[PDB]
Design a protein around this nucleic acid. Sequence first.
DNA 1: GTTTTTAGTTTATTGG
DNA 2: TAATAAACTAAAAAC
Lengths: 227, 226
Amino acid sequence: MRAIWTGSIAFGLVNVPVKVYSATADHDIRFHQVHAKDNGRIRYKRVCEACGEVVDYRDLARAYESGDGQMVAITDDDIASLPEERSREIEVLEFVPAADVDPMMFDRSYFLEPDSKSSKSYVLLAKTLAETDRMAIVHFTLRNKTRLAALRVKDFGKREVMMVHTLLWPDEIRDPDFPVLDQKVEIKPAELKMAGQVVDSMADDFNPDRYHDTYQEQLQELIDTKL
Amino acid sequence: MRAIWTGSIAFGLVNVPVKVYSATADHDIRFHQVHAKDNGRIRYKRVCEACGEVVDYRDLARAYESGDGQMVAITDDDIASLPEERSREIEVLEFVPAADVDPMMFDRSYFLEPDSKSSKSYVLLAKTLAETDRMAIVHFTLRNKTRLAALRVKDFGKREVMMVHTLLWPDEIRDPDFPVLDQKVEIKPAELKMAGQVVDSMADDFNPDRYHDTYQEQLQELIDTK
DNA sequence: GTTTTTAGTTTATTGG
DNA sequence: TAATAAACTAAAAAC
């Protein structure tokens, strides 16, 4: 129950205050690592193999390994090349219809809950996005790194909010140069009908209530078992 | 290019041999941890706080820590209490229209292509999913873990390849507990009607070609210093 | 064997 | 004080 980001939407000169929230959280049980012999929590020490001594974090540096195994100590100015990391405002690039986006790149989502002082300007954007059904492709800065993200509105009955989903880059989808589907397809139309009623008998409507994390609940029962 | 697992979609009687591929492979640059005094790589080795002696992994146990900080001695039989890990087939539950699912739950995507020489069984389902235009929800199993996923098709011009996306559980979405947004705001229609074309001034169409990871390319340019 | 892929696990900022 | 990204181990299936 705590926000993550506190900035504004920098589309032109609009600057609506927004309180980004973590839309989803990993309810999956995260365990801990302990030593059964002596009941001791485990800690990792980073010790060089060749010499064998402990060091503080501040004396090491990032190193990119190429095919030949070269090591490069990245200079501070090279990392500081981006002026967008200095930026702390969501920059808006364009607006695209919601049906013109592909559902594969939607990686992680966050809420956009505004500040009540100027909520009138926020509700205008929300109602406009509900009207034109236009998704917004926005540059997103977070955790000192920049991710391409989308901005769109999802009704929740009582109140409408806009939601931000971080997409992968367009170069982050492998092109499937598959040769097996270039084979000529020979299907008699008599067979095509059978697949119809087979799926149609399995008809249903999306019911999120019925679905459960089957393993996680049975493992959670273990937690209550011991204590 | 190497596959991940080789099973087969198995609901009722249909059993189409399939070869799952990784749809997205993060090409973001990954770095090792290195310091100059050794001029070499770094290793993580595990020690006990109280003992102070290096211990092997094989004599350590899973532990869950509640608010009280109590231990949990995880055994093998209780971990094996769920036999879905033994399954190596994609189990299908139902089919749902593509418009009845919302795009938030998609987490990671995987491709689906046949393995056997006969591809008729694949193409039947592929053409079926492009006619009824309905998704399919599976009880996907992968890497001794079970995750809910869904089947749907992305026509790539020449092939009707269908893909699988792993969705989060319905309890994995936090409720929108904002009691401030329900406030009634009176908007003059003039503001909305002049904001209409204001938004439309920035209208465009999706052009993935011109979008790039600027930071990744600048950093890569730094790597090519050699 | 093989290097990829993937899930499990401290850990080190940073921002409410 | 809690969430997100670095970076490594540690299985662990395909062929």
